[PDB]
Amino acid sequence: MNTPKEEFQDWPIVRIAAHLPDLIVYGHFSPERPFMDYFDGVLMFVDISGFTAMTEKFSSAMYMDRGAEQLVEILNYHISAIVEKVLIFGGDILKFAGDALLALWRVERKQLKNIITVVIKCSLEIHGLFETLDIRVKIGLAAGHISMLVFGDETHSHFLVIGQAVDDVRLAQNMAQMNDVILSPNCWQLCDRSMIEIESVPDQRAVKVNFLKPPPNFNFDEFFTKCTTFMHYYPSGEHKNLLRLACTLKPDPELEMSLQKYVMESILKQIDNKQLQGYLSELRPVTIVFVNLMFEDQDKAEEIGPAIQDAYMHITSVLKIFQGQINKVFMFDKGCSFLCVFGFPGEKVPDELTHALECAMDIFDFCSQVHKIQTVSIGVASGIVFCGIVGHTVRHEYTVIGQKVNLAARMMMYYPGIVTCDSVTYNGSNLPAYFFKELPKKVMKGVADSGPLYQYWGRT
Template identity: 35%
Template sequence: MKALGKSPDKGREAAGVNFPSRLVQLAAFLPDLLLYNDHCSVQRTLPSVETFNGVLLCAEITGVLLYGGDILNFTGDGLLVLWKGSRSQLSNIITLVAEYSLRMQWWFEYTCSSMDLELQLKIGLSAGHVSQLIVGDEKCQYLLVTGQQVDDARLAQSLAETWEVILSPNCWELCKRDILEAKKIPGQKAVKLRYVKNLHQDYSCHCGKWISSLQKFSGILRRNASILSPNSEHEKALRRFVVGNILEKIDDNQPLKFFSELRPLTVVFVKLQFYESIKMPESCGSIQEATVHISGTIESSRGKILKISTFGKVQMAARMLMLYPGLIACDEVTYSKSGLPSRFFKKLPDEEMNDAVTSEVKYEYLGRKKNP
């Protein structure tokens, strides 16, 4: 517990632990896209939108910081990573990300076979315009990326078989085809990456210098955010993007190993669907309105929005959302722990899930009004 009347610095001295500044601890939970954004200020007008060029990787993977990737979002066992750059840099970045993807595929396959692990790794790449959207209110704010390239990365990943890397049509169009060898996929414009050809000396030298510049301090620190200087205004802006229980641990100067938690939760997924013809300003306004409304509604019951994602949802609750559209569905544990009479629920028909086989019974919540 944090002692009253003591400064954070005195608390650190008493504990005999050298804690990084609060700004650095906040940065550990946020992507660089947010940390070094010009719009990261307390006075930001919401929703805030920025468009830039980049290469996106959608996969179930770790270790991307070694190659300069910025982890934007985790969703269950999915991962979305961004390499931001100018339009002229995209072809080189695609080559870098393709090389990294193949190396990670080899490493995962070798590790799984040697340790007898049943893991699957499927990677999809896309490149082009990406939009960054910040929504929320004066208390909490959320960063998400959206646009055609996010959808393309997700689609490319869904087309991949185990240990495959799929390039979206736009990624294949922008890449250096004299370096990347790919195979066409029947009925698709996306292609399967086979291998990266021997890189010519100039590119290898350039790529090596780029990666070396990212791996500072002999590989101990992978992010510039690790050495951020204390800045009260920057810290105040970033605090709005971190959930409350993490902020409490940071303010209490708790060691990083205590930040992970395991607690019973009730999780609700809400899916927003837009017409394909909708324009970016309209969709951003709708997401902002939904965010503020949902946050205000669940706040009275101590509910919080944990994540807003645009690139897939793979947890059990999200799978049920996809399997039973238009219904309020729940699992057997939620049904039994709700304390409500059985007449408020109806058993749902079994549906086979694409990436998970489960025999668990699922229910539709009918509501009190339908069953007085």
């Protein structure tokens, strides 16, 4: 009797799980919203610098209208290698945000110290990938308490991580110079100091890592193996040649119904072989509406949870009216941000700029009266941005990348408490001019020669 080879089956449920971390794929938690969970772990925030510039460049005539295709190709080539490292060292990639990504190693408190060592080593191997484009990487690491929030409605779900380790990992990464691995103070507080040579960082309790210098008889591979005891989903045994246990998921309608809610319809369409796999890679003009919500305490998940849910229910019904799409949600320095987009592929509408502004105002007014929301700020910018599926085959997400994405983000941060917009949006919208106010020019981190900015004042 033959024993023929089983071919890898690439079922829809497996294709969907590529878009989600194990935190969600194997999380099996209540379908009630908000849902909050609490655990400990180590975070790695890997930032690529140089891509919003390359993005601008690939618009130029030299790429012969294959700019989006070339950009996605070169981007994925690099990011794939970072994703392999993270996964092979046992991390869960939680989210992609432009050219950056956040990864988690979830463990019991007592194992934090050893895991931090695994993560530091992963970090240094990722720094190593780029001694070989004007691109390099900064890495922030944090460790401690983490909360998960799941929010949404009956057809769509989003998740977020929250808490002091989350805010820290961002702080850490923003202190880094090109090539630094920075540890949060709590990460440095909890780590095995006999292993790692650091240096101080100016007016900063965080630290920079210089070296991983392990004692005479330390064998990384045996240390790693001990560490895998604490890793629920590390591929092993018959499946040790796979990057992710999720590659072995089998059809299961209940599970697929749950997971599909995290993924955009147009992605699902491609997953279902009803749209060419290259239709979603595009350099196309869009409008980013970037919404920031600040709370008195952005680590109190039980407080901010209901608020984010309340805001999400409003934001989604307002966006629905204009094929606006929430592309990502995540904690910023201050607050929870919604990266919303008008004009993704297959979703254009006329008078997009006007609608973006009115939808922004509507969100601003509703969110400003939600209970625990202390301040709403919204940034609106329009231009050519890259849209596409970024990452590795086994772990990837739809993202947007562009100077306008960064500008909308910097506007909501540098002009808090109002709805602001760029010149492009101001000029192309069809609204009375006295609904705007022209603003003072602020010098904004990672932004040059933005034309005039405006506040969208609305009627009076």
